[PDB]
């Protein structure tokens, strides 16, 4: 769909998981999609834990410099539903564990721009009715 729709979806998603009740006034359609992605990223995380001993922490110390390489790397060979969910779950980890909850700082905007540009640059919206 619309590029503005996907930019709005990613920002709303990041704001919701950031506990940033610095709300919005977006529509019903964006909100039900944010909900589906939140549910999917939790189911994803649960699979990640069932398979691995550690979680994302160590690899994200320098997320401000490497995030784009991680995403590029994530979609180097193929793009599918599961990896796109991993894409959002990484972002959810940054807002939940790395950054401060409840406030929308400049680093959130950096995370947002990064994810919005990557999601769009790579036509990620074509692999998602999920």
């Amino acid at each position: 769909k619309s590029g503005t729709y996907w930019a709005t979806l990613i920002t709303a998603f990041l704001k919701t998981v950031s506990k940033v009740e610095e709300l919005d006034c977006v529509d019903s359609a964006v909100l039900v999609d944010v909900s589906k992605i939140i549910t999917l990223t939790q189911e994803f995380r649960r699979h990640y834990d069932s398979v691995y001993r550690a979680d994302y922490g160590p690899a994200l110390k320098n997320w401000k410099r490497d995030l784009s390489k991680l995403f590029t790397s994530l979609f180097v060979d193929v793009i599918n539903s599961g990896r796109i969910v991993g894409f959002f779950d990484v972002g959810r980890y940054v807002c939940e564990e790395v950054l401060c909850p409840g406030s929308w700082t400049e680093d959130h905007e950096l995370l947002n721009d990064c994810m919005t540009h990557f999601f769009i640059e790579n036509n990620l919206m074509n692999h998602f009715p999920l």
Partner: peptide, 24 residues
């Protein structure tokens, strides 16, 4: 930089397997 690669690897694996316990 390598540790980052381990992450993308763990994510690709989980992404691919997610696809089937959700792909069914």
């Amino acid at each position: 930089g390598g540790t980052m690669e381990n992450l993308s690897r763990r994510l690709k694996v989980t992404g691919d397997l997610f696809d089937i316990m959700s792909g069914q």
